[PDB]
Amino acid sequence: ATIRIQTDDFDLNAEVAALRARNPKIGALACFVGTVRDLAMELEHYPGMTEKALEKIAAEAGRRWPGIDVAIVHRVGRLLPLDQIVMVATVASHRGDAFASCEFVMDYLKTEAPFWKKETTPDGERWVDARSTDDAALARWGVE
Amino acid sequence: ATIRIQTDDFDLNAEVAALRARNPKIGALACFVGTVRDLAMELEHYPGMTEKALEKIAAEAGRRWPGIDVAIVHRVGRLLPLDQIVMVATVASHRGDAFASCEFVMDYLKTEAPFWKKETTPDGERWVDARSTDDAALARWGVE
Ligand SMILES: [Br-]
Ligand SMILES: [Br-]
Ligand SMILES: [Br-]
Ligand SMILES: [Br-]
Ligand SMILES: [Br-]
Ligand SMILES: [Br-]
């Protein structure tokens, strides 16, 4: 369960190869990459706190789908349109568990991991909670 | 809808970048890579026929989730343990459609795309239908 928050960009290929190297006997790999939509974003985490939340999310995915492995890399800092934001990769013996766990981790990440976005309000620059709400995902995964 | 069957190996990064370059305004990308499990595999397709089936699968994904784009690269030939077999990548405005369409394409590919595996039987070398059966996926996607 390799989880990282960084400012540098990540290499999906390299992260996928390392996950496979840690899981020599299973071969179904699902991944997700989110990128700043071209519709600047300044993202900040809570050092230590946010990583622990991501570790808890990956651990819960492992409880629900025994035998998977999970990698998460999330960026922070000043991110431009088209920049990569986050990648989640999971591996399993079969594609069903790989897809489900990858989407579960993304849903839980987007709704619960502590991140903040900088926004300029009339008072001035503020940091606004970047967590999303997804009520259909919560019902899907059995939580209220 | 870029669909290819080839003997050469593929580069997930390069394929993902090209898909994003064809979809400048949406940023949620889901992908799947299947690899020969380390438990040689000789895979063959039906030239023309198999590509058309993959195109039909991607078109149906586009009918179900308007606004997505889909890329499929499938390998054939003599594939060793740990070799990449197949990649499917989808992009959408939001992660829900990206994940669902990617899994749908993989399920339909694995159960319906014409591929054959070489096997040595008592009579001798034979080519056996490599399509899988998934009855839970068929129910999930509304087909009987
Ligand atoms: Br790490
Ligand atoms: Br995202
Ligand atoms: Br599979
Ligand atoms: Br092509
Ligand atoms: Br596969
Ligand atoms: Br998203």
Side-chain angles (χ1 to χ4, degrees), chain A residues 1-38 40-122 124-143, chain B residues 1-38 40-122 124-143:
Chain A
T2 300
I3 280 81
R4 225 160 61 231
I5 293 161
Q6 65 190 45
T7 61
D8 285 338
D9 202 3
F10 53 81
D11 181 336
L12 181 62
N13 272 1
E15 300 302 326
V16 158
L19 183 61
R20 297 193 171 279
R22 296 187 301 275
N23 295 277
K25 304 299 281 189
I26 53 182
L29 181 135
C31 57
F32 179 87
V33 178
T35 53
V36 180
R37 209 185 172 192
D38 190 16
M41 176 189 333
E42 288 212 32
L43 261 188
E44 285 320 318
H45 69 304
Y46 191 151
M49 170 95 64
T50 304
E51 286 95 338
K52 282 178 191 78
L54 295 175
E55 290 159 7
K56 169 180 196 187
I57 292 164
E60 172 64 10
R63 192 193 64 79
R64 289 169 178 242
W65 295 279
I68 67 164
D69 200 6
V70 179
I72 306 167
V73 184
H74 204 299
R75 296 180 70 200
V76 291
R78 193 175 164 274
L79 304 164
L80 291 177
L82 305 179
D83 283 352
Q84 295 181 133
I85 301 166
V86 55
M87 62 152 284
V88 173
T90 63
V91 60
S93 65
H94 300 101
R95 64 179 182 279
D97 288 1
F99 277 120
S101 61
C102 191
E103 183 161 23
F104 172 85
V105 170
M106 276 302 299
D107 285 344
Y108 199 173
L109 183 156
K110 285 290 180 178
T111 61
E112 295 300 320
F115 287 97
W116 290 261
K117 249 180 57 78
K118 193 189 75 166
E119 287 175 0
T120 314
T121 75
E125 285 195 344
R126 297 296 179 262
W127 289 96
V128 310
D129 181 9
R131 286 173 318 167
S132 301
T133 59
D134 195 321
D135 293 325
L138 295 189
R140 171 176 186 187
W141 304 121
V143 302
Chain B
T2 300
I3 280 81
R4 225 160 61 231
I5 293 161
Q6 65 190 45
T7 61
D8 285 338
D9 202 3
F10 53 81
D11 181 336
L12 181 62
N13 272 1
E15 300 302 326
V16 158
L19 183 61
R20 297 193 171 279
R22 296 187 301 275
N23 295 277
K25 304 299 281 189
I26 53 182
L29 181 135
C31 57
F32 179 87
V33 178
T35 53
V36 180
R37 209 185 172 192
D38 190 16
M41 176 189 333
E42 288 212 32
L43 261 188
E44 285 320 318
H45 69 304
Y46 191 151
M49 170 95 64
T50 304
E51 286 95 338
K52 282 178 191 78
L54 295 175
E55 290 159 7
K56 169 180 196 187
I57 292 164
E60 172 64 10
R63 192 193 64 79
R64 289 169 178 242
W65 295 279
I68 67 164
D69 200 6
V70 179
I72 306 167
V73 184
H74 204 299
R75 296 180 70 200
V76 291
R78 193 175 164 274
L79 304 164
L80 291 177
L82 305 179
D83 283 352
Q84 295 181 133
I85 301 166
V86 55
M87 62 152 284
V88 173
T90 63
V91 60
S93 65
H94 300 101
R95 64 179 182 279
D97 288 1
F99 277 120
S101 61
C102 191
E103 183 161 23
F104 172 85
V105 170
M106 276 302 299
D107 285 344
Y108 199 173
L109 183 156
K110 285 290 180 178
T111 61
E112 295 300 320
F115 287 97
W116 290 261
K117 249 180 57 78
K118 193 189 75 166
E119 287 175 0
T120 314
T121 75
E125 285 195 344
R126 297 296 179 262
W127 289 96
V128 310
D129 181 9
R131 286 173 318 167
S132 301
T133 59
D134 195 321
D135 293 325
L138 295 189
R140 171 176 186 187
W141 304 121
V143 302

